[PDB]
Design an enzyme around this catalytic site. Structure first.
Site, short mmCIF file in Angstrom:
data_model
loop_
_atom_site.label_atom_id
_atom_site.label_comp_id
_atom_site.label_asym_id
_atom_site.label_seq_id
_atom_site.Cartn_x
_atom_site.Cartn_y
_atom_site.Cartn_z
N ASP A 144 0.86 -1.30 -0.06
CA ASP A 144 0.05 0.13 0.06
C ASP A 144 0.79 1.34 0.00
O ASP A 144 0.66 2.32 0.75
CB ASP A 144 -1.23 -0.03 1.18
CG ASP A 144 -2.24 0.94 0.79
OD1 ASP A 144 -2.43 1.16 -0.24
OD2 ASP A 144 -2.89 1.18 1.74
N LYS A 146 1.75 4.76 -1.38
CA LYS A 146 1.10 5.78 -1.69
C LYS A 146 1.45 6.91 -0.93
O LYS A 146 1.95 6.86 0.16
CB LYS A 146 -0.48 5.45 -1.76
CG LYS A 146 -0.88 5.18 -0.33
CD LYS A 146 -2.48 5.10 -0.67
CE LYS A 146 -3.13 4.67 0.80
NZ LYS A 146 -4.92 4.47 0.39
N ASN A 149 0.53 7.13 2.57
CA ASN A 149 1.37 6.15 3.76
C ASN A 149 2.71 6.77 3.88
O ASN A 149 3.54 6.00 4.27
CB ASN A 149 1.11 4.94 3.25
CG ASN A 149 -0.31 4.41 3.54
OD1 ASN A 149 -0.82 4.75 4.52
ND2 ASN A 149 -0.59 3.56 2.73
N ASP A 165 2.31 2.55 7.92
CA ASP A 165 1.09 1.80 7.57
C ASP A 165 1.36 0.38 6.96
O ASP A 165 1.49 0.22 5.67
CB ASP A 165 0.01 2.46 6.63
CG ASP A 165 -1.45 2.06 6.57
OD1 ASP A 165 -1.59 0.87 7.46
OD2 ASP A 165 -2.10 2.39 5.76
N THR A 184 -4.64 0.21 -3.41
CA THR A 184 -5.40 1.50 -3.62
C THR A 184 -5.45 1.86 -5.08
O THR A 184 -4.33 1.46 -5.72
CB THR A 184 -4.66 2.63 -2.90
OG1 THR A 184 -4.86 2.27 -1.52
CG2 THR A 184 -5.46 3.93 -2.95
N1 LIG Z 1 3.41 7.67 12.99
C1 LIG Z 1 2.90 8.66 12.71
N2 LIG Z 1 2.74 9.93 12.96
C2 LIG Z 1 2.21 10.82 12.57
N3 LIG Z 1 0.75 10.60 12.15
C3 LIG Z 1 0.55 9.46 11.85
C4 LIG Z 1 1.55 8.23 12.13
N4 LIG Z 1 0.64 7.02 11.86
C5 LIG Z 1 -0.21 7.45 11.60
N5 LIG Z 1 -0.65 8.64 11.34
C6 LIG Z 1 -1.73 9.40 10.75
O1 LIG Z 1 -2.97 8.78 11.28
C7 LIG Z 1 -4.09 8.43 10.08
C8 LIG Z 1 -4.25 7.24 9.72
O2 LIG Z 1 -5.50 6.52 9.21
P1 LIG Z 1 -5.51 6.10 7.61
O3 LIG Z 1 -5.51 7.21 6.58
O4 LIG Z 1 -7.15 5.27 7.10
O5 LIG Z 1 -4.78 4.89 7.36
P2 LIG Z 1 -4.71 3.58 8.06
O6 LIG Z 1 -4.45 2.32 7.29
O7 LIG Z 1 -6.09 3.39 8.79
N6 LIG Z 1 -3.73 3.61 9.34
P3 LIG Z 1 -2.29 4.49 9.21
O8 LIG Z 1 -2.20 4.93 7.68
O9 LIG Z 1 -1.26 3.67 9.67
O10 LIG Z 1 -2.70 5.42 10.33
C9 LIG Z 1 -3.28 9.40 8.98
O11 LIG Z 1 -3.34 10.83 8.90
C10 LIG Z 1 -1.67 9.15 9.51
O12 LIG Z 1 -1.02 10.11 8.83
CA LIG Z 2 -2.93 4.68 5.65
MG LIG Z 3 -3.92 0.66 6.18
#
Ligand SMILES: Nc1ncnc2c1ncn2[C@@H]1O[C@H](COP(=O)(O)OP(=O)(O)NP(=O)(O)O)[C@@H](O)[C@H]1O
Ligand SMILES: [Ca+2]
Ligand SMILES: [Mg+2]
Ligand SMILES: [Ca+2]
Ligand SMILES: [Ca+2]
Ligand SMILES: [Ca+2]
Ligand SMILES: [Ca+2]
Ligand SMILES: [Ca+2]
Length: 470
Positions: A144, A146, A149, A165, A184
């Site tokens: 994933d 992108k 991420n 992610d 995606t």
């Molecule tokens: N280590 C980090 N530092 C700062 N922001 C984070 C971090 N990890 C996750 N985020 C933020 O939390 C949100 C994630 O939700 P989402 O966009 O649906 O992806 P996800 O697969 O659900 N989980 P993820 O992308 O890992 O957080 C995004 O704004 C990320 O940028």
């Molecule tokens: Ca994500």
């Molecule tokens: Mg994810």
């Protein structure tokens, strides 16, 4: 390098410091704000030390999927990949304690500035490809990749970006093809839609990112998954003349390579990193880096971990307790020494690093090859024959910075799992993931530290031991 396959002794890696915490998360951290969103991501502050962490709160069969993500994350040690610190669990949630990046998503940068000039795009791409190269060499496929991420370490800066992610990621073998349709639409490789693929799908996702950075829109467009998928399947894309006329041939050539439809003929991440376009924007050691290079390589040359408790402690503090700012300059040196961008320093890369340093400073002829073989014996914590990011930080940072009272207390408490105030032989074996350690291994710890002769190590003895190493 069959020498590294036998008679290695105890291997230590940063994954060993991630424990499943039985305590209540709310007793170790407090909420600052919601970062997003499966569940939630929260910015939280450590009740002790007040360092900030991004805690991924995952709502609860499916525990197989969470434990896989944890095992993938635990193994990650690279400058451009997220770092995992700890895991907590309660009745309704799993909590993944990760490093917080304040600069937001690469995607937001795309919203704001529409497109990037080639210099910025190459800098972003070298980092993504370095992360991906390292993943693929460690038999991990992200699936994933992108701009959503990819996070920026610092606000408005592209100096160091981070792949995050790993929810869709998996280990992969060369002997079996992957089959799950995940990704995606804009970024997903055609062979993933056909449900038969390998790690080459990430390279394709990187080719889509590069295309977007350079012109502001995706190569396989549409406004719904259905439309985009149709274009991805067909595999045809174009460099619109007006949008691409001023972009270099080298950039377009790399994109073509990364978007080669046949995944067997598509370049590897390593090959992408060795393209003319990426090489053109190379950032190598120059005279400006002499002071940090000198400090780094002088510390590395002098490093002795002594016995296994001290070595364990050092790699803990280096890999989990040093901040992004404390690491800034060393992270920058690490990347520059890493000529091939695979996120590991090899012997040829270290030799070259020392030669470059000696040329900035002319004495007796040294045998630099032998000096590096000897350095590797001391600094290679996981006994794999390479220097990984956290091993580098741990042996190149000043002991004055690493061995603060607070850090030594944290290291002691991680080893002393029962909170008895003394570290036992068995607690050390448990840290290293072994059923037991030898009498000689523990006696080597004891000889250097056990002042009260009880065959255990207390905090006072620990501190005295660690300061004696300084
Ligand atoms: N280590 C980090 N530092 C700062 N922001 C984070 C971090 N990890 C996750 N985020 C933020 O939390 C949100 C994630 O939700 P989402 O966009 O649906 O992806 P996800 O697969 O659900 N989980 P993820 O992308 O890992 O957080 C995004 O704004 C990320 O940028
Ligand atoms: Ca994500
Ligand atoms: Mg994810
Ligand atoms: Ca050996
Ligand atoms: Ca390398
Ligand atoms: Ca190593
Ligand atoms: Ca104990
Ligand atoms: Ca003792």
């Amino acid at each position: 390098g069959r020498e590294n396959l036998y008679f290695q002794g105890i291997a230590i890696n940063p994954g060993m410091y991630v424990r499943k915490k039985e305590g209540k998360i709310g007793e170790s951290y407090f909420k600052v704000r919601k970062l997003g969103s499966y569940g939630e991501v929260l910015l939280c502050k450590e009740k002790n030390g007040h360092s900030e962490k991004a805690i991924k709160v995952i709502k609860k069969k499916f525990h197989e999927e969470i434990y896989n993500e944890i095992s993938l994350l635990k193994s990650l040690d690279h400058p451009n990949i997220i770092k995992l610190f700890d895991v907590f669990e309660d009745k309704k949630y799993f909590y993944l304690v990760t490093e917080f990046y304040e600069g937001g998503e690469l995607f937001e940068q795309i919203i704001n500035r529409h497109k990037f000039d080639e210099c910025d795009a190459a800098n972003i791409m070298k980092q993504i490809l370095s992360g991906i190269c390292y993943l693929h060499k460690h038999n991990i496929v992200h699936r994933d990749i992108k701009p959503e991420n990819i996070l920026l370490e610092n606000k408005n800066s592209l100096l160091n970006i981070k792949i995050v992610d790993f929810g869709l990621s998996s280990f992969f073998s060369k002997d079996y093809k992957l089959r799950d349709r995940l990704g995606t639409a804009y970024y997903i490789a055609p062979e993933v839609l056909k449900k038969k693929y390998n790690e080459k799908c990430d390279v394709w996702s990187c080719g889509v990112i590069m295309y977007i950075l350079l012109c502001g829109y995706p190569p396989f467009g549409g406004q719904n998954d259905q439309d985009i998928i149709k274009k991805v399947e067909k595999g045809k894309y174009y460099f619109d003349f007006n949008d691409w006329k001023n972009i270099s041939d080298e950039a377009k050539e790399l994109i073509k390579l990364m978007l080669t439809y046949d995944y067997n003929k598509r370049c590897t991440a390593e090959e992408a990193l060795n393209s003319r376009w990426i090489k053109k924007y190379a950032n190598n050691i120059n005279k400006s880096d002499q002071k940090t290079l000198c400090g780094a390589l002088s510390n590395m040359r002098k490093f002795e971990g002594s016995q296994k408790l001290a070595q364990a402690a050092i790699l803990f503090i280096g890999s989990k307790l040093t901040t992004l700012e404390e690491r800034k300059e060393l992270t920058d040196i690490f990347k520059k020494l890493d000529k091939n961008g695979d996120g590991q320093l090899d012997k040829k890369e270290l030799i070259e690093g020392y030669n470059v340093l000696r040329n900035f400073k002319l004495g007796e002829l040294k045998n630099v090859e032998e000096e590096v073989d000897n350095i590797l014996k001391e600094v290679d914590f996981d006994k794999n024959g390479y220097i990984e990011y956290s091993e580098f930080i741990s042996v190149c940072m000043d002991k004055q910075i690493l061995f603060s009272e607070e850090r030594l207390r944290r290291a002691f408490n991680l080893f002393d799992t029962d909170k008895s105030g003394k570290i036992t032989k068995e607690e050390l074996a448990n840290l290293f993931g072994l059923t037991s350690i030898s009498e000689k291994t523990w006696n080597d710890v004891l000889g250097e530290a056990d002042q009260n002769k009880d065959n255990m190590i207390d905090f006072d003895e620990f501190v005295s031991m660690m300061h004696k190493i300084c």
